[PDB]
Amino acid sequence: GWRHACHALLYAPDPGMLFGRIPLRYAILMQMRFDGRLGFPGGFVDDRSLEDGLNRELREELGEAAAAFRVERTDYRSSHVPRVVAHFYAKRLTLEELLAVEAGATRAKDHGLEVLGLVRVPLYTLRDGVGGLPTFLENSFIGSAREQLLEALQDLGL
Amino acid sequence: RHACHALLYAPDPGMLFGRIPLRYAILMQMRFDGRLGFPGGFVDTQDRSLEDGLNRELREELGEAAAAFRVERTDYRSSHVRVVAHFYAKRLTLEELLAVEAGATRAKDHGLEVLGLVRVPLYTLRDGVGGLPTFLENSFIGSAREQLLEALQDLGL
Ligand SMILES: [Mn+2]
Structure with a gap:
């Protein structure tokens, strides 16, 4: 009936401080996609299970350090709605596993093709009330990804 | 006050979807401010050469792999106005550029002032909006979008 998609919010506690003063709370990964979104x-x-496909895709896009974990059914968060069903997952990593995914991503199959690069989501809001999270949310996103991010940030009290 | 920034680029023979030529890998950064x-x-006045200072900041922001090249006066391209943004464009090999991408993940600024690197998609998808035209509707800092555009016309794309 539907064409199934699976996306994963990978995140890690980050005790780091921007400019020595501003607290990042989490490292949260998103990708700049080939379409500029x-x-x-x-x-x-396509794939023997929905978790199989997702993890395969994560390997193709993030590289082999994505085999250091495995997004399982337990990690399964939401399903949003052409005839595409968007299955949202969330996976808590150590900042170690996440840094390693950032490094390995510059040499995944999809580097420079489908994936134009990775970014962290700024959870803070800067001085003037625009920089950081609010400005980040005014870029362009693939369908629902802004809503899945907002949905997920509040599932963490943020 | 003066600032210096650098468009680093390299030929990628990659064909997106097997059909769309990526012409150049062109490197931009997502800054801590979401732009x-x-x-x-x-x-600064401990850099007394605009070029000395720019290379120093690409060491800080991209890591030691940026030591495999130097951006020079001969690469200068524009200035925009108080701050004065000076802009340079530097041709690298893909392997050099690739080294900078994998270096950037271990640089000082990674995870702080630099949220991550992104390439510029130089193509337009068939719908006429995906790719370069949508990328350009993202938020940019300062004169960065016009510098991106001048650089793309001066390279004939
Ligand atoms: Mn100009």
Whole structure:
């Protein structure tokens, strides 16, 4: 009936401080996609399980350090609505596993093709009330990814 | 006050979807403020060469892999106005550029002032909006979008 997609919000506690003063709370990964839009890592499933496809896609897009974990059904968060069903997952990593994913991503299959690069989501809001999170949210996103990010940030009290 | 930034680029024979030629890998950064921009930053009076200062900040922002090249006066391209943003474009090999991408993840600024690097998609998808025209509707810092555009016309794209 539908064409199934799976995306994953990968995040890690980050005790780091911007400019020595501003607290990042989490490292949260999103990808700049080949179409110029921010989105979550993942894609379409085809693949013995929905978690199989998602993890395969994560490997193709993030590289082999994505085999150091495995997004399982336990990690499964939401399903949003062409005839595409968007299955949203969230996976808590150590900042270690996440840094390693940032390094390995510059040499995944999709580097420079489908994936134009990774970014962290600024959770802070800067001085003038625009810089940081609010400005970040005014870029362009693939369908729902802004809503899945907002949905997920409040599932963490943020 | 003066700032220096650098468009670093290299030929990629990659064919997106097997059909769309990526012509050049062109490197921009997502800054801590949620805006796209070019590697670089403010130049000082302990740098007494605009070029010395720019290379220093690409060491800070991209890591030691940026030591495999130097951006020079001969690469200068524009200035815009108080701060004065000086802009340079530097041709690298893909392997050099690639080294900078994998270096950037271990640079000082990674995870703080630099949220991550992104390439510029130089193509337009068939719908006529995906790719370069949508990328250009993202938020940019300072003169960075016009510097991106001048650089793309002066390279004939
Ligand atoms: Mn100009």
